[PDB]
């Protein structure tokens, strides 16, 4: 699983 | 932006 | 599954 | 702004 | 899942 | 999982 | 700002 | 795990 | 930006 | 600033 | 597992 | 920046 943001 | 994968 | 937005 | 969950 | 953006 | 950005 | 957890 | 950035 | 993988 | 844990 | 930010 | 791996 993954979560990211910019 | 943002992303979630599961 | 996935969720994203910009 | 954003809020999410799975 | 669920999402809210504002 | 869960995410909040502001 | 951001907050997340899994 | 968990993360907070400010 | 920020990233979490699990 | 940041705070995290696993 | 991993967590990072810049 | 910061990094945690486990």
Curated annotation (Swiss-Prot), chains A, B, C, D, E, F, G, H, I, J, K, L:
Record note on modification: The glycosylation pattern (the amount of mono-, di- and non-glycosylated forms or glycoforms) seems to differ in normal and CJD prion.
Disease: PrP is found in high quantity in the brain of humans and animals infected with neurodegenerative diseases known as transmissible spongiform encephalopathies or prion diseases, like: Creutzfeldt-Jakob disease (CJD), fatal familial insomnia (FFI), Gerstmann-Straussler disease (GSD), Huntington disease-like type 1 (HDL1) and kuru in humans; scrapie in sheep and goat; bovine spongiform encephalopathy (BSE) in cattle; transmissible mink encephalopathy (TME); chronic wasting disease (CWD) of mule deer and elk; feline spongiform encephalopathy (FSE) in cats and exotic ungulate encephalopathy (EUE) in nyala and greater kudu. Creutzfeldt-Jakob disease: Occurs primarily as a sporadic disorder (1 per million), while 10-15% are familial. Accidental transmission of CJD to humans appears to be iatrogenic (contaminated human growth hormone (HGH), corneal transplantation, electroencephalographic electrode implantation, etc.). Epidemiologic studies have failed to implicate the ingestion of infected animal meat in the pathogenesis of CJD in human.
Record's comment describing the protein's domains: The normal, monomeric form, PRPN(C), has a mainly alpha-helical structure. Misfolding of this form produces a disease-associated, protease-resistant form, PRPN (Sc), accompanied by a large increase of the beta-sheet content and formation of amyloid fibrils. These fibrils consist of a cross-beta spine, formed by a steric zipper of superposed beta-strands. Disease mutations may favor intermolecular contacts via short beta strands, and may thereby trigger oligomerization.
Protein name per the record: Major prion protein
UniProt miscellaneous comment: This protein is produced by a bicistronic gene which also produces the alternative prion protein/AltPrP (AC F7VJQ1) from an overlapping reading frame.
Domain of life of the source: Eukaryota
Localisation: Cell membrane; Golgi apparatus
Quaternary structure and partners: Monomer and homodimer. Has a tendency to aggregate into amyloid fibrils containing a cross-beta spine, formed by a steric zipper of superposed beta-strands. Soluble oligomers may represent an intermediate stage on the path to fibril formation. Copper binding may promote oligomerization. Interacts with GRB2, APP, ERI3/PRNPIP and SYN1. Mislocalized cytosolically exposed PrP interacts with MGRN1; this interaction alters MGRN1 subcellular location and causes lysosomal enlargement. Interacts with KIAA1191. Interacts with ADGRG6.
Family under the similarity heading: Belongs to the prion family.
Reported function: Its primary physiological function is unclear. May play a role in neuronal development and synaptic plasticity. May be required for neuronal myelin sheath maintenance. May promote myelin homeostasis through acting as an agonist for ADGRG6 receptor. May play a role in iron uptake and iron homeostasis. Soluble oligomers are toxic to cultured neuroblastoma cells and induce apoptosis (in vitro). Association with GPC1 (via its heparan sulfate chains) targets PRNP to lipid rafts. Also provides Cu(2+) or Zn(2+) for the ascorbate-mediated GPC1 deaminase degradation of its heparan sulfate side chains.
């Amino acid at each position: 699983g993954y979560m990211l943001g910019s």
